Design a protein around this nucleic acid. Structure first.
Ligand SMILES: Nc1ncnc2c1ncn2[C@@H]1O[C@H](COP(=O)(O)OP(=O)(O)OP(=O)(O)O)[C@@H](O)[C@H]1O
Ligand SMILES: Nc1nc2c(ncn2[C@@H]2O[C@H](COP(=O)(O)OP(=O)(O)O)[C@@H](O)[C@H]2O)c(=O)[nH]1
Ligand SMILES: [Mg+2]
Length: 349
RNA sequence: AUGAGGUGGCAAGAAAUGGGCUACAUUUUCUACCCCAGAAAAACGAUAGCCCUUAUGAAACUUAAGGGUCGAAGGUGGAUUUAGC
């Protein structure tokens, strides 16, 4: 536990201690993305406490040393399953949001590339496919996270939604987002327009952009979605995926592209694929490189004690032997300091 | 000719019954995977029927296999009753 709640002052001195996110900030900045199990824990406890760690502090120092004049640099948080990459990305997202950044956050790319009942054909490009439901979902999440910047940011082009309906240069980005949401048919197109406008305006310096993409390995992998002829679909055929790759490019400046690999839900990948190349594949490695790889691993004994004491204080560990050092040692044995295994045991312990 | 040889052919269903397989689903449907996920959920449910193609073969309505098609009965079951330490 730390008294410091501002995400710009805390550093290594706070290592091994929880950092609280207020409910209002959780709602605004993080209406999505956060792991389902941590969401259940937050619902149970009324406390969104993430222990600060070297990975998150490192990437915060990276973003403080970043020069927006530089073309946006890529960072890649990689590791095994349940090492907390998602929560580190969320922590840094909170930092940038409190720093007034525009957070272009992708909660998970695995969802975008599977189980898409609504798969129409993009009007803007008849050779691609749209995912109106997911487009609307992410548009709503982005609006929730950056409503303030939504109005402040204007468009710089004419965008035709129908033969008679269009949006005009200089209009606020709110008009585009509203069109995408209400007119779900235009959802993917609005997502692409938003990505383009945010990229160009970050280049112009209207704000500072953090492109925080979770499970980035999905983009350059494979897809299970099948055409009306049952043919397989490659990722580029998904306008969302192609636009997200365009964003993953570093050609633009005015921000940084942070990403976090995630095997959870990955397609055709064996359970043990956790290395950057093994996940991204040749195409993904080639697209991301250059990148700064940051490892996320199990807990150390200090952070293990911090997590256990957090659960004990919250009384989550309602069993009698949980405070006992023997129970602590058994938890360490079973979870090998793995955050996800530890929590998935503590849930019924 | 109650012996021998050659060509062609039914191998069906009022009705009952024995055994087996598949189900009626949510402990399920589906993918990935081979067990830390996302969808389906009145859809589940035919190895049956119809058409086409492929393998075998001299010969495929005859057999088997693959695709499409159709999505039927049924929603845990009567008399009763089988097997297992
Ligand atoms: N810094 C942290 N503060 C609090 N809890 C944490 C922290 N890091 C990890 N945990 C706990 O670890 C659990 C497991 O993390 P989780 O699996 O969601 O992360 P991940 O790195 O995205 O992994 P996965 O590959 O499983 O998606 C989280 O639910 C959370 O309870
Ligand atoms: N409906 C619509 N969509 C647009 C328009 N302009 C841009 N977009 C969307 O914004 C995305 C980015 O556009 P852009 O990169 O310039 O097109 P591309 O380079 O040819 O792929 C596209 O995928 C479109 O879906 C427009 O005028 N109308
Ligand atoms: Mg994570």
């Amino acid at each position: 536990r730390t008294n410091e709640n501002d995400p710009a002052k805390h550093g290594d001195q706070h290592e091994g201690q929880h950092y609280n996110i207020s409910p209002q900030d959780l709602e605004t900045v993080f209406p999505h993305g956060l792991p389902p199990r941590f969401v259940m824990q937050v619902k149970t406890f009324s406390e969104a406490c993430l222990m600060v760690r070297k990975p998150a502090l490192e990437l915060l120092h990276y973003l403080k040393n970043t020069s927006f004049a530089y073309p946006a640099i890529r960072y890649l948080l990689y590791g095994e399953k349940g090492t907390g990459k998602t929560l580190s990305l969320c922590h840094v997202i909170h930092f940038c949001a409190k720093q007034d950044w525009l957070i272009l956050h992708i909660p998970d790319a695995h969802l975008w590339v599977k189980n898409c009942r609504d798969l129409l054909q993009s009007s803007y490009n008849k050779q691609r496919f749209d995912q109106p439901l997911e487009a609307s979902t992410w548009l709503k999440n982005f609006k929730t996270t950056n409503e303030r910047f939504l109005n402040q940011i204007k468009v710089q082009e004419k965008y035709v939604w129908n033969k008679r309906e269009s949006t005009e240069k200089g209009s606020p980005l709110g008009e585009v987002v509203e069109q995408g949401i209400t007119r779900v048919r235009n959802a993917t197109d609005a997502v692409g327009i938003v990505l383009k406008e945010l990229k160009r305006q970050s280049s112009l310096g209207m704000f500072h952009l953090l492109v925080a993409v979770d499970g980035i390995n999905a983009l350059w992998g494979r897809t299970t979605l099948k055409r009306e002829d049952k043919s397989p679909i490659a990722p580029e055929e998904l306008a969302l995926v192609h636009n997200l790759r365009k964003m993953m490019k570093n050609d633009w400046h005015g921000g940084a592209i942070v990403s976090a690999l995630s095997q959870t839900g990955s397609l055709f990948k064996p359970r043990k694929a956790y290395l950057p190349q093994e996940l991204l594949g040749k195409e993904g490695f080639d697209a991301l490189d250059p990148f700064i790889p940051i490892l996320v691993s199990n807990y150390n004994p200090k952070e293990f004690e911090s997590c256990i004491q957090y659960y004990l204080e919250n009384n989550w560990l309602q069993h009698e032997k949980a405070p006992t050092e023997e129970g602590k040692k058994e938890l360490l044995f079973l979870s090998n300091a793995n955050p996800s295994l530890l929590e998935r045991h503590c849930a019924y312990l």
